[PDB]
């Protein structure tokens, strides 16, 4: 019945009690179409973003927010808003911006608009606490994070449910990559502030903590030269 | 006071100054998505309703952004955002690109509210989709725990939304039903003949 009353009574979050064709072909064609993983160690604050070419069809942007380290370099929304994301986005392209659950819900929307996108979806990462039943401004206990989807230019649900990670673990659920990939938005996919642990076929990962690089702009571009320029990433 | 109260009206034209101050405002507006125009929304006299307290603002589609605009326009800061996860009777989950499993409610604060029970509930609601456009009754429990006993006002509510401690405004309610003596006075002074027009 009333799982909010139940959460006040016991500490089990209401999302703990959520239970539960073949989109396997998509994921198999994604796999056949995927470029080899490419990755580059770069201090994105000090890095000229324009050296990342060609323009990207998808950008996953995962700035390290201070709120991700409650009991544990952080980027402020001031830092984030100054990234020249519009300079590397293809004229039709998508962004997925992890915004946290505080002021990023507002400041990440300003960012999207600043870079020329309109928000078309709000993906919520709902964190369960089955294994362990505040911000000054908070009215409620925050048990979720938001990933805003933005679109510029001309299957799945908007919820990801997983158990809350252990303290100090900042990873976002890898489910976000399946949502993005299931869209078939194109093959130039960029993950900014990725890590060694997030490197993935089909993606160029750029972040300060990577321990190795293999990126080469010419090699990277060769993946999308004719006849491969406009594949969705979901074809042969 | 305490029992349900309501006013059938067009919220554009009611003089809400007669209603006093509320600890919580809730609104479920008929946003002009895919109805009140954006300008009518902006011009609602929300600011007279509270001095210190919270507003709960349901939003969808492009109103996620417009509702943020109105929120700040009316003098609030957004300090939380509640999502209702819509399930069936078996607790499974029931705007192109992605299917929608949830509805959003912005939470704004105005002034410096004191004596509220911040942090008793979490920002997720899991509840069964009853009727189309019927909001989950758990929100009233969260709101009551947050601010027990205080005066609350709902805008664009429906008859099933009338609750104790709440005044409900909407254009499909059954007449006027007011019991708070201060409200009844200022309503008589402002509307001696019982008609609401300009
Ligand atoms: C012209 N000025 C008006 C207009 C007016 N309304 C217009 C006519 C219906 C009205 O009376 C009752 N509200 C609804 O039915 C209503 C129901 C659902 C929704 C969408 N929700 C979104 C959040 C979710 C929890 C639930 C779904 C939005 C409104 C309100 N009321 C007074 N003045
Ligand atoms: Mg709850
Ligand atoms: Mg998949
Ligand atoms: Mg949508
Ligand atoms: Mg009900």
Curated annotation (Swiss-Prot), chain A:
Q: Where is this site: Interaction with METTL3?
A: 106, 109
Q: Name one GO biological process term.
A: mRNA modification
Q: Where in the cell is it found?
A: Nucleus
Q: Which of UniProt's keywords are assigned here?
A: Differentiation, Nucleus, Phosphoprotein, RNA-binding, Spermatogenesis
Does the record's keyword annotation contain Transmembrane helix? no
**Which parts of the sequence are annotated with region: Interaction with METTL3?**
19-20, 101-102, 119-122, 137-146, 155-158
Q: Care to name a GO molecular-function term for this sequence?
A: mRNA m(6)A methyltransferase activity
* Region of interest (Positively charged region required for RNA-binding), residue spans: 109-118
Q: Which GO terms describe its cellular component?
A: nucleoplasm; nucleus; RNA N6-methyladenosine methyltransferase complex
Judging by the UniProt lineage, the source's domain of life is Eukaryota
Protein family according to the UniProt entry: Belongs to the MT-A70-like family.
Biological role = The METTL3-METTL14 heterodimer forms a N6-methyltransferase complex that methylates adenosine residues at the N(6) position of some mRNAs and regulates the circadian clock, differentiation of embryonic stem cells and cortical neurogenesis. In the heterodimer formed with METTL3, METTL14 constitutes the RNA-binding scaffold that recognizes the substrate rather than the catalytic core. N6-methyladenosine (m6A), which takes place at the 5'-[AG]GAC-3' consensus sites of some mRNAs, plays a role in mRNA stability and processing.
Q: What is the protein's quaternary organization?
A: Heterodimer; heterodimerizes with METTL3 to form an antiparallel heterodimer that constitutes an active methyltransferase. Component of the WMM complex, a N6-methyltransferase complex composed of a catalytic subcomplex, named MAC, and of an associated subcomplex, named MACOM. The MAC subcomplex is composed of METTL3 and METTL14. The MACOM subcomplex is composed of WTAP, ZC3H13, CBLL1/HAKAI, VIRMA, and, in some cases of RBM15 (RBM15 or RBM15B).
What is the protein name for this chain?
Answer: N(6)-adenosine-methyltransferase non-catalytic subunit METTL14
Q: Which organism is it from?
A: Homo sapiens (Human)
Which residues of the parent chain are present? 117 to 390 of 456
Swiss-Prot record, chain B:
Q: How does it assemble?
A: Heterodimer; heterodimerizes with METTL14 to form an antiparallel heterodimer that constitutes an active methyltransferase. Component of the WMM complex, a N6-methyltransferase complex composed of a catalytic subcomplex, named MAC, and of an associated subcomplex, named MACOM. The MAC subcomplex is composed of METTL3 and METTL14. The MACOM subcomplex is composed of WTAP, ZC3H13, CBLL1/HAKAI, VIRMA, and, in some cases of RBM15 (RBM15 or RBM15B). Interacts with NCBP1/CBP80. Interacts with EIF4E. Interacts with EIF3B.
Similarity comment: family membership: Belongs to the MT-A70-like family.
Q: Which domain of life is it from?
A: Eukaryota
Effect caused by changing residue 97 to A:
Decreased methyltransferase activity
Function noted in UniProt: The METTL3-METTL14 heterodimer forms a N6-methyltransferase complex that methylates adenosine residues at the N(6) position of some RNAs and regulates various processes such as the circadian clock, differentiation of embryonic and hematopoietic stem cells, cortical neurogenesis, response to DNA damage, differentiation of T-cells and primary miRNA processing. In the heterodimer formed with METTL14, METTL3 constitutes the catalytic core.
**Residue ranges of region Interphase loop?**
89-101
List of residues binding S-adenosyl-L-methionine: 10-11, 28, 135, 158-161, 171-172
The cellular location(s) given in this protein's UniProt record come to: Nucleus; Nucleus speckle; Cytoplasm
Leader sequence residues: none
Q: What is this protein called?
A: N(6)-adenosine-methyltransferase catalytic subunit METTL3
GO molecular function: any one? RNA methyltransferase activity
Upregulating conditions: Overexpressed in a number of cancer tissues, such as lung adenocarcinoma and colon adenocarcinoma.
Q: Name one GO biological process term.
A: primary miRNA processing
Return the annotated region ranges for Gate loop 1: 29-37
Q: What is the effect of changing residue 161 to A?
A: Abolishes methyltransferase activity
Q: In which tissues is it expressed?
A: Widely expressed at low level. Expressed in spleen, thymus, prostate, testis, ovary, small intestine, colon and peripheral blood leukocytes.
UniProt organism field: Homo sapiens (Human)
Give the residue ranges for region: Positively charged region required for RNA-binding.
92-100
Q: Where do the record's region annotations for Gate loop 2 lie?
A: 129-137
Residue ranges, annotated region (Interaction with METTL14): 77-81, 91-102
> Which UniProt keywords are present, listed alphabetically?
Acetylation, Biological rhythms, Cytoplasm, Differentiation, DNA damage, Immunity, Innate immunity, Isopeptide bond, Methyltransferase, Nucleus, Oogenesis, Phosphoprotein, RNA-binding, S-adenosyl-L-methionine, Spermatogenesis, Transferase, Ubl conjugation
Note what the entry says on domains. Gate loop 1 and gate loop 2 regions are adjacent to the S-adenosyl-L-homocysteine-binding site and display large conformational changes upon ligand-binding. They may play an important role in adenosine recognition. The interface loop contributes to the heterodimer interaction.
Q: Mind telling me how this protein is modified after translation?
A: Sumoylation inhibits the N6-adenosine-methyltransferase activity. Sumoylation does not affect subcellular location or interaction with METTL14. Desumoylated by SENP1.
């Amino acid at each position: 019945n009333d799982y909010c009353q139940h959460f006040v009574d016991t500490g089990h979050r209401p999302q703990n009690f959520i239970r539960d064709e073949l989109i396997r072909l998509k994921d198999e064609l994604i796999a056949k179409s995927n470029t080899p993983p490419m990755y580059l160690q770069a201090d994105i604050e000090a890095f000229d973003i324009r050296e990342l070419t060609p323009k990207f069809d998808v950008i996953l942007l995962e700035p390290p927010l201070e709120e991700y380290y409650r009991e544990t370099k952080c980027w402020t929304w001031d830092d984030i808003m100054k990234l020249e994301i519009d300079e590397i986005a293809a004229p039709r392209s998508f962004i997925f911006l992890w915004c946290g659950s505080g002021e990023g819900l507002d400041l990440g929307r300003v960012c999207l608009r600043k870079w020329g996108y309109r928000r078309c979806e709000d993906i919520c990462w709902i964190k369960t606490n089955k294994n362990n039943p505040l911000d000054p401004k908070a009215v409620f206990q925050r048990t979720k994070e938001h990933c805003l989807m933005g679109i510029k230019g001309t299957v799945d649900i908007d919820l990801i449910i997983t158990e809350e990670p252990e303290i100090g673990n900042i990873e976002k659920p890898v489910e976000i990559f399946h949502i993005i990939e299931h869209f078939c938005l194109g093959r130039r996919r960029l993950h900014l502030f990725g890590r060694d642990s997030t490197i993935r076929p089909g993606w160029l990962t750029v972040g300060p903590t990577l321990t190795n690089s293999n990126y080469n702009a010419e090699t990277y571009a060769s993946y999308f030269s004719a006849p491969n320029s406009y594949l969705t990433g979901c074809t042969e | 006071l305490f029992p349900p109260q309501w006013i059938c009206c067009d919220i554009r034209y009611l003089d809400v100054s007669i209603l006093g101050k509320f600890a919580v405002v809730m609104a479920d507006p008929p946003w002009d998505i895919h109805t009140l125009t954006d300008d009518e929304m902006r011009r609602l006299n929300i600011p007279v309703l509270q001095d210190d307290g919270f507003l709960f603002l349901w939003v969808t589609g492009r109103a996620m952004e417009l509702g943020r605009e109105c929120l700040n326009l009316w003098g609030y800061e957004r300090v939380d955002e509640i999502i209702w996860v819509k399930t069936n009777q078996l607790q499974r989950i029931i705007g192109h690109w992605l299917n929608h499993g949830k509805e959003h409610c912005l939470v704004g604060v105005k002034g410096n509210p004191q004596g509220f029970n911040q942090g008793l509930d979490c920002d997720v609601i899991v509840a069964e989709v009853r009727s189309t456009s019927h909001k989950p009754d758990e929100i009233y429990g969260m709101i009551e725990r947050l601010s027990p006993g205080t005066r609350k006002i709902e805008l664009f509510g429906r008859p099933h939304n009338v609750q104790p401690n709440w005044i409900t405004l909407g254009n499909q309610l059954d007449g006027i039903h007011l019991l708070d003596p201060d409200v009844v006075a200022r309503f008589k002074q402002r509307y001696p003949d019982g008609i609401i027009s300009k």
